[model samples]
Target chain A: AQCEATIESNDAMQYDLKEMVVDKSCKQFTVHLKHVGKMAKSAMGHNWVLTKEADKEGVATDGMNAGLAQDYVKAGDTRVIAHTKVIGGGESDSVTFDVSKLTPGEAYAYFCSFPGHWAMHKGTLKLSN
Target chain B: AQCEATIESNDAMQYDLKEMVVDKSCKQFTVHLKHVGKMAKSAMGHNWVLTKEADKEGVATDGMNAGLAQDYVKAGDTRVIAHTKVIGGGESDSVTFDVSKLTPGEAYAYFCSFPGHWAMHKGTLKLSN
Candidate 1:
């Protein structure tokens, strides 16, 4: 049950990590979302959201409806496996979820739900062999 | 007195180029917008719009008012230097305009006005030394 990872986002609105691999040996996984930009969260905030691939768009739409006050994520959204709070430049947030939430060979998508960021700031996260 | 450049957009809603240069010697310049993504325009449209850097957000706001029929640009709006029609996957459009419209040492912004794409799918265009 030893698993942890760190991810970073920059002012260019790009994630330093494109794909994340979770070691199946770990009982839980934690991902740290770091914002290295010098911008306010209101101008260019970021968050890490985990969901099934098919649910990405739908979740994003609902999250947008939820608005920025909620960090661009729907509260208590069952579809979301886990997520971090929106952060501004130089800030960081982390989300930890049970490894059992993931199944081997199943695809998981990790994205930024910050309005337009999801489209550009997203990547695939999968359980490693 | 003539110049041309091509910009490419992908499924990620990103442009291939971050900034473009126009030959200062030219009196006119053209830009070709290409969408190589395999998605419908409605779902993932792409367009290229040129405006003064300072007017980027304001023009984008009004262009959203002009709606998609006008390629998300205000019809006959003086601030808009040029724009291309929104295109789906595998489609392309181009726009030509007078280079004299640009002043030396001024920053110009070119972006896709497909809803949220402007914020992410934008770049700078300037006359080169």
Candidate 2:
């Protein structure tokens, strides 16, 4: 249970969880994202993207520019630590990353990178002992 | 035709026409919107919503809150003079409104109300003789 988590996105541009904590004891962590709203992917798609707090805007801007085929995440964007595929209503996607990749005490940002979603549907992530 | 116009939307969150003119001779005007990209409606969905220039942000904010089922437009909103259903890639939607609703010298704002798209995918509409 400590090694994984689930998040929900809705058509109102919201996420169920505002913040997530990863257990430091785990070598890796996985995130499962679900779209609980009925809008189609083109209209209200949702995706989970993780990046440094300082890099959130840049990654989102570039990802939106990169278009949806790349899952709204820029290709080969080193700033992106992990991300899930963009999805629509009743659909789900997941992503995993090594816990070691996260720096302790550092604030990581996670959000839905779907065009206009990042500004309102994001929360902080951090590693915990 | 003098009474109707066509617009195109793409994956980059763009609308082909930045401005549109409605013929004053017409009693009614119709707008045809086409999504030329391949993304699903939830990911890159688009719609044509028309309102007073000052009402654009308010309508868009309330519409985003209205959820997607109402096609991202608040139900029975008088500020919304006309609107089309949200569409996905390779799809199209249209709406017709009576020209009598317009004030000859006033500017109308038309934009896609999909989540974050209004900021970049908007344009102006005006009646002309």
Candidate 3:
């Protein structure tokens, strides 16, 4: 079976995994994120962001300024390869990105851009042959 | 002059400023946070948390798992110096901490801890004479 991933988030600011491996054979990859807590998004919102490792800081900085209506992500930020909408407890979101965006040798970082959640809510994503 | 601050966060997931300066003369410091967007908290929540640089990741990690009832902050977490409750658009929260807890020449970070909002919703805080 082709590999698909579902990650969980709760009222706590975390994702269930620290690393996600994507099989290159899959033409398209999907990441499902579930928020399992009871808080509303305005209080404990979460989202998933993918970007080159070097671009993480810059992208996060700008995204923070983008506000929630923009999903905390800067509009038209070329650095973001993919992202999910901000979600609150008991809600969920997902994003599908072409596998072609992955480079075998490069490192990518994934994180939740919800205010202070990034430092603890980050993981690494790798593409495998 | 004593400096008081009001920072605004909207449904877009952003804070209006990147840095905050605290005047040492104030015996108690107050930070007012307003959620200015139209979205509900469960869909676009936000909060403010304060901690030492070293404890940031650990506190954020454990807090994420603590769930929303705990305010996305772990119960009895000594690392958390101060925090505001999570809020949605059109909502607001505030936190006050003793100025004595702040030390000059130490770098402190302030951020929102709603699941994915941290990275983009952060600011540097400095104690100024």
Candidate 4:
């Protein structure tokens, strides 16, 4: 579906996509995260986490405390809108969230929940008509 | 005096400066790194290491193997032009290197080798004429 998007992560701790435009036509949107590197999850794991742009720092802080086994997303973290599981190289995960969770034209931040990833391995997502 | 530059690191896993320009007038340059956040080296350590852009990944990888006790740097890593001792929040360290080691017009990379930090806590260093 046009509502689905795939992004790739690498050992460099970078996301291939910097900006994502979500079409307003979709009722639901899915984000597929693919790890293309060769490092083990324990060393260079990655995950896609979604939250309001302003909520990114706080959400990532709590997510870090959740640790790796939890996919680095805090349990019952209301700040998180949607997130994919933490994955290592060659691994993949996806998350689907109701389009209603986001407001059109609002900026949202998406990032890897891995320990230091949130600082640099991130992007902006915006809903577009 | 102005040939020296200072950079800051914090618990957020980020460096304040995204790039440093080394003026060609000085025969030596220094980088002063300060940790302004409150965190332990065991949990959120930071270091400033310099190397050729091409040597960044290899240096960081080997430094990770060297462990924190060694400031996360390999023993006498020939590739490292200079580096600060790893420090935790509230701590500080600095490194001075010969300006002759740098080739004008060439870009170098400066990064933290503390576990996952290299991915996000990094910047560019260049020699300017």
lDDT of each: 0.84, 0.88, 0.81, 0.87
For model 4, how does the per-residue alpha-carbon lDDT over B38-107 read when each residue is reduced to its tens digit?
9777557799999999999899988977877888899999999999999988999988889999988998
Q: Which candidate order results from sorting by DockQ in descending order?
A: 1, 3, 4, 2
Q: Write the per-residue lDDT of candidate 1 for residues B44-81, one digit (tens) a residue.
A: 78899999998888888677657778888888888889
Candidate 1 lDDT tens digits, A1-129:
358888999765568998899987888899988998887775568899999999998888788668778988999999999989999889999889998988899989888887556666789999985
Candidate 4's residue-wise lDDT over A28-114, tens digit each? 999999999987787688999999988998888788768777888999899899999998889998889998999986999998777
RMSD of each: 4.7, 13.5, 14.7, 9.2
Candidate 4, superposed: residue stretches over 4 Å from native: B1-92, B95-115, B118-129
Per-model DockQ against the true two-chain complex: 0.18, 0.14, 0.17, 0.15
Candidate number of the best DockQ: 1
iRMSD value for model 4: 6.0
Q: Which ten residues in a row have the lowest lDDT in candidate 4 chain B?
A: B37-46
- DockQ measured for candidate 3: 0.17
Q: Which portions of model 3 show Cα errors greater than 4 Å?
A: A1-3, B1-129
Which CAPRI level is candidate 3? incorrect
